[PDB]
Paper text:
Sialin (SLC17A5) belongs to the solute carrier 17 (SLC17) transporter subfamily that includes nine related transmembrane major facility superfamily (MFS) transporters, all of which are dedicated to anion transport, including the vesicular glutamate transporters 1-3 (VGLUT1–3) and a vesicular nucleotide transporter (VNUT). Sialin adopts a classical MFS fold consisting of 12 transmembrane helices (TMs) with two pseudo-symmetric domains: N-domain (TMs 1-6) and C-domain (TMs 7-12). The Sialin structures in both the lumen-open and cytosol-open conformations reveal a solvent-accessible cavity, which forms the substrate translocation pathway, at the center of the interface between the N-domain and C-domain.
To capture the lumen-open state, we introduced a mutation on Arg168. Lys168 forms a salt bridge with Glu171 and does not bind to the main chain carbonyl of Arg57. Indeed, the S61A and R168K mutations confine Sialin in the lumen-open state, indicating the importance of these residues in regulating the conformation of Sialin. Dali search shows that the overall structure of SialinR168K shares a similar fold with, VGLUT2 and monocarboxylate transporter 124 (MCT1) with R.M.S.D. values of 1.2 Å and 2.4 Å. The lumen-open structure reveals that the hydrophilic interactions between Arg195 on TM5 and Gln273 on the cytosolic helix, Ser196 on TM5 and Arg353 on TM8, Lys197 on TM5 and Asp350 on TM8 seal the substrate translocation pathway from the cytosolic space. Therefore, we employed Glide28 to dock the sialic acid into the cavity. The top three positions are similar, suggesting that His298, Tyr301, and Ser411 form hydrophilic interactions with sialic acid.
Residue numbers in the entry: 34 to 70, 81 to 87, 95 to 487
Write the structure that this text describes.
Amino acid sequence: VCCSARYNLAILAFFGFFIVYALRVNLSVALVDMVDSKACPEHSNQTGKKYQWDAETQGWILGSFFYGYIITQIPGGYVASKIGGKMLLGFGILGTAVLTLFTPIAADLGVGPLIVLKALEGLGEGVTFPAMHAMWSSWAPPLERSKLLSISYAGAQLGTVISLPLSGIICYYMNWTYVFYFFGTIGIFWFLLWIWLVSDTPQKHKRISHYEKEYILSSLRNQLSSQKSVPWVPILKSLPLWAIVVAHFSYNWTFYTLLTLLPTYMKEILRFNVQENGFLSSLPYLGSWLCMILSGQAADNLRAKWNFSTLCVRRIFSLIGMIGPAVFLVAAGFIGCDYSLAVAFLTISTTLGGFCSSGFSINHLDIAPSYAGILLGITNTFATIPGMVGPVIAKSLTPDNTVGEWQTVFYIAAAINVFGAIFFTLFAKGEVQNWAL
């Protein structure tokens, strides 16, 4: 029932991730109005002051977020597994939402303060995904993980879906600064709700029913660890974890391509101006969100009714969500000058990538539930490298900017995706490892 305690936590986490991603992606679409301004046959007021920022300054402003996001992944996961994930997640999203309120001031102070503000946002926000895994490690029954971790993380996709047009509408009807204030006060209200309505374990919940707490505890009974000391050497030497690391790296490289280079491909080759309606940039994330939810529910229905193994379901959904994007990404390079088919292939790739919300993205809990925060921190410290090294690759592989070099970039993305999917399918596991007991 949606009124349950675990599902209420899942809904509140959905909204938390929604708000944090809406805060993250609102700068790229509000930066256009705060700065001071041949393959296809060229298909194709405001208040406040404008800053003179070239492309390099905007790139360093936008990309400096991940340089803090990559630092507090493993420390955040460790602290979350030690003390609990509620306060870590709440205060991370609160730091993101309260630093946003100061962005109109940090901008006017200079590029230095803006880069520092984005790095502080990254530092505070890097701890939210490991904290959410370390929270579900005590809340999600083993046969309910694909549902809850899909409803929880589906906030990011709807977060972008809502942030891209709504922030533009706010910046059109009003000043550009009113984006940050609006999303910041919304994040503050969500933090006020999160502190009140959630607890980091079912035992520490003050409203949970007795039968539900007993159900959750007896389901997670035979999977929790009794070491109380993190086995770093078995974790690092475990091949089923490096399988998730390789898969997650490959998937984040492929989606960095699909969601940063492909809209740039349609601008520099198809001349499409990807939005062209405002909502065409949100449709891919919308399909991705819907597919995330539906694939989580389908994976859990499989594991519960049809008696599929956990490993078999992880393999199936990872193979789908990592070969679909690659296959539809290779074909997107052959599209010539058809902008509509390019947007269709982008949407089909981003939609089929929602299946991975029940693939490797949950396998951190299936192989080591009591240490899922540290495992997700480890797999996210590697997976945020494609988001920051990728730009160098795209800028060094397209000096002439022809269709051939873009096809080469798409081939590299697809090869990395296929290698990641095959490596995961080969070396992944779905049962709690012996070092996690």
